[PDB]
Design an enzyme around this catalytic site. Structure first.
Site, PDB file in Angstrom:
ATOM      1  N   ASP D  64       0.862  -1.173   0.000  1.00 31.93           N
ATOM      2  CA  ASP D  64       0.000   0.000   0.000  1.00 31.93           C
ATOM      3  C   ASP D  64       0.901   1.226   0.000  1.00 31.93           C
ATOM      4  O   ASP D  64       1.549   1.512   1.011  1.00 31.93           O
ATOM      5  CB  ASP D  64      -0.908  -0.003   1.235  1.00 31.93           C
ATOM      6  CG  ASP D  64      -2.068   0.969   1.124  1.00 31.93           C
ATOM      7  OD1 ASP D  64      -1.883   2.111   0.665  1.00 31.93           O
ATOM      8  OD2 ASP D  64      -3.188   0.597   1.524  1.00 31.93           O
ATOM      9  N   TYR D 157     -11.705  15.446 -14.939  1.00 34.10           N
ATOM     10  CA  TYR D 157     -10.390  14.873 -14.588  1.00 34.10           C
ATOM     11  C   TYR D 157      -9.818  15.635 -13.400  1.00 34.10           C
ATOM     12  O   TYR D 157      -9.148  15.049 -12.553  1.00 34.10           O
ATOM     13  CB  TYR D 157      -9.416  14.741 -15.764  1.00 34.10           C
ATOM     14  CG  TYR D 157      -8.261  13.785 -15.489  1.00 34.10           C
ATOM     15  CD1 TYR D 157      -8.490  12.406 -15.402  1.00 34.10           C
ATOM     16  CD2 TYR D 157      -6.934  14.261 -15.298  1.00 34.10           C
ATOM     17  CE1 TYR D 157      -7.449  11.510 -15.163  1.00 34.10           C
ATOM     18  CE2 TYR D 157      -5.872  13.383 -15.079  1.00 34.10           C
ATOM     19  CZ  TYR D 157      -6.145  12.000 -14.992  1.00 34.10           C
ATOM     20  OH  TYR D 157      -5.171  11.053 -14.724  1.00 34.10           O
ATOM     21  N   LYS D 164      -1.145  14.443 -11.856  1.00 29.76           N
ATOM     22  CA  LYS D 164      -0.348  13.959 -12.995  1.00 29.76           C
ATOM     23  C   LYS D 164       0.728  14.968 -13.385  1.00 29.76           C
ATOM     24  O   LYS D 164       1.842  14.546 -13.750  1.00 29.76           O
ATOM     25  CB  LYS D 164      -1.220  13.574 -14.197  1.00 29.76           C
ATOM     26  CG  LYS D 164      -2.022  12.303 -14.031  1.00 29.76           C
ATOM     27  CD  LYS D 164      -1.194  11.062 -13.645  1.00 29.76           C
ATOM     28  CE  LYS D 164      -2.069   9.825 -13.733  1.00 29.76           C
ATOM     29  NZ  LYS D 164      -1.301   8.528 -13.631  1.00 29.76           N
TER      30      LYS D 164
HETATM   31  N1  LIG Z   1      -7.361   4.001 -18.062  1.00 30.00           N
HETATM   32  C1  LIG Z   1      -6.929   5.130 -18.647  1.00 30.00           C
HETATM   33  O1  LIG Z   1      -7.720   5.708 -19.350  1.00 30.00           O
HETATM   34  C2  LIG Z   1      -5.531   5.731 -18.413  1.00 30.00           C
HETATM   35  C3  LIG Z   1      -4.896   6.544 -19.367  1.00 30.00           C
HETATM   36  C4  LIG Z   1      -3.631   7.110 -19.115  1.00 30.00           C
HETATM   37  C5  LIG Z   1      -3.032   6.846 -17.881  1.00 30.00           C
HETATM   38  N2  LIG Z   1      -3.650   6.061 -16.950  1.00 30.00           N
HETATM   39  C6  LIG Z   1      -2.925   5.787 -15.688  1.00 30.00           C
HETATM   40  O2  LIG Z   1      -2.359   4.461 -15.741  1.00 30.00           O
HETATM   41  C7  LIG Z   1      -2.205   3.912 -14.433  1.00 30.00           C
HETATM   42  C8  LIG Z   1      -2.788   2.507 -14.486  1.00 30.00           C
HETATM   43  O3  LIG Z   1      -4.201   2.567 -14.295  1.00 30.00           O
HETATM   44  P1  LIG Z   1      -5.181   1.605 -15.106  1.00 30.00           P
HETATM   45  O4  LIG Z   1      -5.916   2.472 -16.104  1.00 30.00           O
HETATM   46  O5  LIG Z   1      -4.475   0.339 -15.572  1.00 30.00           O
HETATM   47  O6  LIG Z   1      -6.335   1.266 -14.023  1.00 30.00           O
HETATM   48  P2  LIG Z   1      -6.292   0.241 -12.754  1.00 30.00           P
HETATM   49  O7  LIG Z   1      -7.396   0.732 -11.805  1.00 30.00           O
HETATM   50  O8  LIG Z   1      -6.263  -1.181 -13.276  1.00 30.00           O
HETATM   51  O9  LIG Z   1      -4.853   0.539 -12.068  1.00 30.00           O
HETATM   52  C9  LIG Z   1      -4.738   1.367 -10.908  1.00 30.00           C
HETATM   53  C10 LIG Z   1      -3.908   0.609  -9.869  1.00 30.00           C
HETATM   54  O10 LIG Z   1      -3.501   1.477  -8.799  1.00 30.00           O
HETATM   55  C11 LIG Z   1      -3.768   0.762  -7.562  1.00 30.00           C
HETATM   56  N3  LIG Z   1      -3.792   1.576  -6.304  1.00 30.00           N
HETATM   57  C12 LIG Z   1      -4.703   2.531  -5.966  1.00 30.00           C
HETATM   58  N4  LIG Z   1      -4.434   3.069  -4.741  1.00 30.00           N
HETATM   59  C13 LIG Z   1      -3.320   2.447  -4.282  1.00 30.00           C
HETATM   60  C14 LIG Z   1      -2.493   2.533  -3.052  1.00 30.00           C
HETATM   61  N5  LIG Z   1      -2.857   3.434  -2.093  1.00 30.00           N
HETATM   62  N6  LIG Z   1      -1.391   1.705  -2.948  1.00 30.00           N
HETATM   63  C15 LIG Z   1      -1.037   0.808  -3.920  1.00 30.00           C
HETATM   64  N7  LIG Z   1      -1.758   0.677  -5.069  1.00 30.00           N
HETATM   65  C16 LIG Z   1      -2.886   1.457  -5.309  1.00 30.00           C
HETATM   66  C17 LIG Z   1      -5.031  -0.070  -7.841  1.00 30.00           C
HETATM   67  O11 LIG Z   1      -5.280  -1.143  -6.920  1.00 30.00           O
HETATM   68  C18 LIG Z   1      -4.710  -0.545  -9.250  1.00 30.00           C
HETATM   69  O12 LIG Z   1      -3.908  -1.737  -9.264  1.00 30.00           O
HETATM   70  C19 LIG Z   1      -2.923   4.860 -13.494  1.00 30.00           C
HETATM   71  O13 LIG Z   1      -1.954   5.658 -12.837  1.00 30.00           O
HETATM   72  C20 LIG Z   1      -3.714   5.787 -14.393  1.00 30.00           C
HETATM   73  O14 LIG Z   1      -3.767   7.095 -13.872  1.00 30.00           O
HETATM   74  C21 LIG Z   1      -4.865   5.506 -17.205  1.00 30.00           C
HETATM   75  C1  LIG Z   2      -9.901   9.477 -18.987  1.00 26.01           C
HETATM   76  C2  LIG Z   2     -10.094   9.366 -17.505  1.00 26.01           C
HETATM   77  C3  LIG Z   2      -9.584   8.492 -16.533  1.00 26.01           C
HETATM   78  C4  LIG Z   2      -8.610   7.381 -16.687  1.00 26.01           C
HETATM   79  N1  LIG Z   2      -7.354   7.962 -16.171  1.00 26.01           N
HETATM   80  C5  LIG Z   2      -6.593   8.655 -17.194  1.00 26.01           C
HETATM   81  C6  LIG Z   2      -6.902   7.945 -14.895  1.00 26.01           C
HETATM   82  O1  LIG Z   2      -5.797   8.371 -14.581  1.00 26.01           O
HETATM   83  C7  LIG Z   2      -7.732   7.446 -13.782  1.00 26.01           C
HETATM   84  C8  LIG Z   2      -7.879   8.168 -12.678  1.00 26.01           C
HETATM   85  C9  LIG Z   2      -8.675   7.733 -11.498  1.00 26.01           C
HETATM   86  C10 LIG Z   2      -8.200   8.015 -10.211  1.00 26.01           C
HETATM   87  N2  LIG Z   2      -8.913   7.650  -9.123  1.00 26.01           N
HETATM   88  C11 LIG Z   2     -10.099   6.971  -9.246  1.00 26.01           C
HETATM   89  C12 LIG Z   2     -10.616   6.662 -10.521  1.00 26.01           C
HETATM   90  C13 LIG Z   2      -9.897   7.053 -11.648  1.00 26.01           C
HETATM   91  C14 LIG Z   2     -11.831   5.973 -10.641  1.00 26.01           C
HETATM   92  C15 LIG Z   2     -12.518   5.575  -9.485  1.00 26.01           C
HETATM   93  C16 LIG Z   2     -11.984   5.906  -8.228  1.00 26.01           C
HETATM   94  O2  LIG Z   2     -12.597   5.599  -7.176  1.00 26.01           O
HETATM   95  N3  LIG Z   2     -10.806   6.593  -8.143  1.00 26.01           N
HETATM   96  O3  LIG Z   2     -10.107   8.910 -15.332  1.00 26.01           O
HETATM   97  C17 LIG Z   2     -10.892   9.935 -15.529  1.00 26.01           C
HETATM   98  C18 LIG Z   2     -11.600  10.599 -14.552  1.00 26.01           C
HETATM   99  C19 LIG Z   2     -12.375  11.678 -14.988  1.00 26.01           C
HETATM  100  C20 LIG Z   2     -12.420  12.067 -16.346  1.00 26.01           C
HETATM  101  C21 LIG Z   2     -11.703  11.354 -17.297  1.00 26.01           C
HETATM  102  C22 LIG Z   2     -10.941  10.282 -16.875  1.00 26.01           C
END
Ligand SMILES: NC(=O)c1ccc[n+]([C@@H]2O[C@H](COP(=O)([O-])OP(=O)(O)OC[C@H]3O[C@@H](n4cnc5c(N)ncnc54)[C@H](O)[C@@H]3O)[C@@H](O)[C@H]2O)c1
Ligand SMILES: Cc1c(CN(C)C(=O)CCc2cnc3c(c2)CCC(=O)N3)oc2ccccc12
Ligand SMILES: NC(=O)c1ccc[n+]([C@@H]2O[C@H](COP(=O)([O-])OP(=O)(O)OC[C@H]3O[C@@H](n4cnc5c(N)ncnc54)[C@H](O)[C@@H]3O)[C@@H](O)[C@H]2O)c1
Ligand SMILES: NC(=O)c1ccc[n+]([C@@H]2O[C@H](COP(=O)([O-])OP(=O)(O)OC[C@H]3O[C@@H](n4cnc5c(N)ncnc54)[C@H](O)[C@@H]3O)[C@@H](O)[C@H]2O)c1
Ligand SMILES: NC(=O)c1ccc[n+]([C@@H]2O[C@H](COP(=O)([O-])OP(=O)(O)OC[C@H]3O[C@@H](n4cnc5c(N)ncnc54)[C@H](O)[C@@H]3O)[C@@H](O)[C@H]2O)c1
Ligand SMILES: Cc1c(CN(C)C(=O)CCc2cnc3c(c2)CCC(=O)N3)oc2ccccc12
Ligand SMILES: Cc1c(CN(C)C(=O)CCc2cnc3c(c2)CCC(=O)N3)oc2ccccc12
Ligand SMILES: Cc1c(CN(C)C(=O)CCc2cnc3c(c2)CCC(=O)N3)oc2ccccc12
Lengths: 260, 260, 260, 260
Positions: D64, D157, D164
């Site tokens: 964590d 966002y 970020k």
């Molecule tokens: N999905 C998208 O659209 C997108 C696009 C660009 C970047 N990202 C970024 O990529 C990364 C991967 O996210 P994803 O989209 O694969 O979704 P995901 O929810 O599968 O991955 C998020 C991970 O972070 C973990 N996490 C959250 N709080 C935590 C804590 N306190 N300690 C340890 N672990 C913790 C979750 O358990 C999970 O494994 C994220 O940082 C996200 O911001 C996502």
């Molecule tokens: C795209 C996009 C994403 C994917 N992305 C780039 C991200 O980085 C995810 C961010 C994220 C961080 N924290 C949480 C969640 C999403 C979902 C639920 C939750 O409980 N906590 O997230 C968004 C959130 C709002 C608007 C657009 C987006």
């Protein structure tokens, strides 16, 4: 006695009362500046002469920025009247219409590219040189007008994107070259405005309408807003700023996407 | 049969073994690609022929980017042997050595600017248009080389800064133009390397030693590192990437001040 | 009656007469604004009262941005005197000093990071919401101070680079959220200046000297220059500008390298 | 034995087979690397152990990132099995749901802000410190995942944009701080993908469609595509690259405006 009391400015790019150059002239004149103007050829002479007199000026010189001679001669004739100069405002850009109408790859020929870059970017660097003597005299400044089609793609702005990016790098190179002599060099990146820079651009209303929806302030900027920011950049208030591209687009550039 | 097995790449810009384009070739041949080359002038037909033979290819065509016929013809000629290409690599840049020596404002004349933009920037757009049907068949990509003198000021890089800035916008416009057809358009921004591009630049040595002290990794980059990056950008691994400027400069771009 | 005749501004972060906020206060008062001030703790209350007095004001409040209630409070107190405000200037940045001395990876600890981001970045967002009702009533603006250590690495700036970067994203988010309501949100990115924000900083002198050599204007910026710029962004001359980071750094940010 | 034959990578962030870290794990396994994984807490231990087995791995530790001990202990525990690591991949980001829904100014409270920056940005710096001994042995690299919401406003966002931004700044400060040890630090800025990170974001689908229409390639990206990008940055082919943000967004970021 306003902010630019006793200051002088040359303004290249008055085509009409709608020009960005005209909004600049007016803001500068509002604040007590004395003005000079160029015109690209005979056809425009009488309309520019006319605008000059509206600003208490009768200093109106031929300058087509394609011809090396026309540039230096315009700065020469200006030396006769003026001791020095507090600023040069460059509001000039152009590309053959055809390069700005269609798919970028199809319509971008070598001559269309040469003209775009030559008139829109090189020319600022040329005017700057021709103007160095008159600007060292007062430690004046240069300002040009750019557009964020240099940084991000807009449909049909095409080779003008490349030319503006060239311009922008120019700004930086000039600011570094001329700063030693106390000459500041900056640009304003203006949001789209309905001027005679829109004539023949089929998309223009719909471009303007998208801008209005995307931009944080929900509106399009005016020549008065560009003018006032030009004024600032041309004034002792901007003394700590050089090589800056100042965005006057009601925040459009800051949006990655809008509510749809 | 490695990462690029049975994929075809044309490479404009090998001149000597120091060339970035040779680095790229070495890397692309190494991963199993079939190659083809151009040369700018007769003088050079000889060494390029050798280098191509060195790469197990006999597809070598004349291409001075100053001449539209020559661009059209090298691509008309190529299509006889290949009915699709997987990428075209653009590694050409030039400005007259006089515009690269001294003060930006003093040395940057019209023809000088004209040539820089024409060879260093227009050429890539023109090569894109010519390779379009060939690229369209295999959904290949385009790649070009840039330098960060586009974005910030280096001494004596001068008008090339502008031409690179133009180029980089071209990357973006091409990408949006060609994107619908699945053609990806990318560039590498490489740190300074001692090549034929260094020739006639008095300042180069000391220029290179500053880079060494500033870059996060505390060393200069090599054509190998640039080649491996180019290989990536020309590989199925780069398939979600277009319009990108990839910095291969040991992190130099990221540093504002170093222990002085 | 100059440019800010009949307009009202709350300035947060005047700490001494070298302060950034001080040059701003002085610039806005000069042009006619009536001013209001916060102070961070009991030990500063007297000099701020003095400084307000200096600038014709009795409008002076406690505001520690670590504590929500003190933010809600200081604006509630202000509403008692003002029915609307033309702008709030936020000039507040802190990080525990041990984060600003040595290697980024070694010294950046969880509580240090928290604190830097809390006071330096979140605080602009907290003050914005509290000022919303009052700013809405005159379509006033917001202004913060940032530094380029967000964009490019500087030696012990460390976790403040992360803070300022978060802050600058703050400016953009705020701008889109508050623009529908006509509220402009901007930043000034100031070159380095010796003030109480230097006071602990081991290598400060060395930086100020490097900056001066690298800047195209070959001098450091003053609080008067940052003041005049804040004034601009705080005036009807900046009506077309929001979400902008304005660089008052004498061109520093535009230089990749300078004669060695 | 592929490109990463006998290299070791720790992967932090696997949540489901939709996860970016999962697409990353698949690409590095594919090309030979041995893997190790962190799980955030007990509910997740099951699924993570399962995936770990898929890519042939026993090395699974609790972590964590909110808690300093578990970072330290996870790397302590790792050190017993591995005498060096070739890279650490950080695919973690979290803000409380309420911050991600509605107006930025209204919904961004102190605690939501702190949580955003703590789990999304700090966590990286923290993981980098503890991985240092392990990364020094093998001159391994770090990689994180960012989102372009840092540079440009996405609706909803919100605070994640500030976090970020801070994360990206961290990438650059880490690169300067660790480069001397031959340790590369980079990020990928991915385009949006439907993952568990889309949970409760009601706008998500309309977002994905907007992305598809605006992107030069006219499609969204996949975890396979981010996976391959990550592979490259974790490989000897990227040895010339540090402090870089590689966009894997099908060129979305390069478009100012698309056909209406
Ligand atoms: N999905 C998208 O659209 C997108 C696009 C660009 C970047 N990202 C970024 O990529 C990364 C991967 O996210 P994803 O989209 O694969 O979704 P995901 O929810 O599968 O991955 C998020 C991970 O972070 C973990 N996490 C959250 N709080 C935590 C804590 N306190 N300690 C340890 N672990 C913790 C979750 O358990 C999970 O494994 C994220 O940082 C996200 O911001 C996502
Ligand atoms: C795209 C996009 C994403 C994917 N992305 C780039 C991200 O980085 C995810 C961010 C994220 C961080 N924290 C949480 C969640 C999403 C979902 C639920 C939750 O409980 N906590 O997230 C968004 C959130 C709002 C608007 C657009 C987006
Ligand atoms: N209108 C917009 O949407 C907008 C937005 C941002 C930037 N800009 C830029 O601002 C500047 C001003 O344009 P405007 O909107 O005032 O339109 P305009 O057409 O009124 O101004 C362009 C000027 O350039 C002059 N010109 C053209 N060729 C020339 C030559 N060979 N020699 C000398 N002068 C020549 C024209 O006579 C004209 O006066 C241009 O550089 C333009 O690209 C325009
Ligand atoms: N060397 C560096 O420091 C460095 C760093 C980053 C980017 N770049 C860029 O990389 C590219 C290649 O440079 P390099 O270091 O490999 O040097 P190089 O001199 O080995 O290669 C330059 C090539 O461009 C070709 N060329 C020149 N004029 C031409 C014309 N009219 N028609 C056709 N071809 C022509 C030359 O023949 C040569 O092959 C250039 O675009 C350069 O600006 C160089
Ligand atoms: N001085 C420079 O070199 C420089 C350059 C660019 C930007 N900046 C930025 O400008 C701003 C002002 O700094 P300055 O140079 O005028 O120094 P300063 O110390 O005079 O101002 C910083 C202010 O932060 C206030 N502050 C600190 N913690 C606080 C809290 N918990 N609650 C309320 N107020 C608090 C201090 O009282 C002080 O008034 C900062 O954001 C700084 O990062 C400074
Ligand atoms: C916005 C915008 C503008 C305004 N702008 C920022 C400009 O820079 C204008 C550029 C321009 C340059 N050359 C010419 C014309 C316009 C029109 C007619 C002509 O013969 N030559 O122009 C566009 C052209 C295409 C797409 C968008 C735009
Ligand atoms: C770095 C660097 C380079 C390499 N580089 C990135 C380049 O883009 C090279 C540019 C170049 C263009 N045209 C010519 C030459 C070099 C040399 C001789 C000649 O006749 N014409 O060039 C510089 C020139 C001045 C300052 C730095 C640099
Ligand atoms: C320039 C510059 C500045 C000025 N600046 C832009 C700042 O943002 C100052 C930041 C700052 C934040 N917190 C503290 C201090 C300064 C000083 C003493 C203290 O106890 N806490 O700060 C630096 C810190 C390190 C390196 C350069 C600089």
């Amino acid at each position: 006695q306003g902010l630019l009391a006793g200051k002088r400015f040359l303004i290249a790019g008055v085509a009409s009362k709608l020009s960005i150059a005209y909004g600049i002239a007016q803001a500068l004149h509002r604040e007590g500046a004395e003005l000079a103007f160029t015109y690209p050829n005979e056809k425009l002479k009488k309309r520019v002469d006319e605008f000059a007199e509206q600003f208490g000026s009768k200093l109106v010189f031929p300058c087509d920025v394609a011809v090396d001679a026309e540039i230096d001669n315009a700065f020469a004739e200006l030396a006769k009247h003026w001791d020095g100069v507090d600023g040069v405002v460059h509001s000039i850009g152009f590309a053959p219409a055809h390069t700005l109408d269609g798919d970028f790859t199809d319509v971008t020929d070598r001559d269309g590219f040469k003209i775009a870059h030559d008139i829109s970017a090189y020319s600022f660097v040329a005017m700057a040189r021709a103007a160095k003597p008159l600007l060292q005299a007062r430690q004046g400044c240069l300002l040009t007008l750019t557009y964020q089609g240099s940084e991000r793609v807009m449909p049909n702005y095409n080779v003008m994107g490349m030319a503006k990016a060239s311009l922008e790098a120019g700004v930086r190179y000039l600011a570094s070259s001329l700063g030693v002599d106390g000459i500041r060099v900056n640009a304003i990146s203006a949001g789209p405005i309905r001027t005679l820079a829109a004539s023949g651009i089929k998309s223009f209303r719909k471009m303007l309408d998208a801008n209005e929806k995307v931009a944080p302030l929900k509106r399009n900027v005016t020549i008065e807003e560009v003018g006032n920011a030009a004024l600032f950049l041309c004034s002792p208030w901007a003394s700590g700023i050089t090589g800056e591209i100042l965005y006057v687009d009601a925040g459009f550039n800051t949006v990655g996407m809008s509510q749809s």
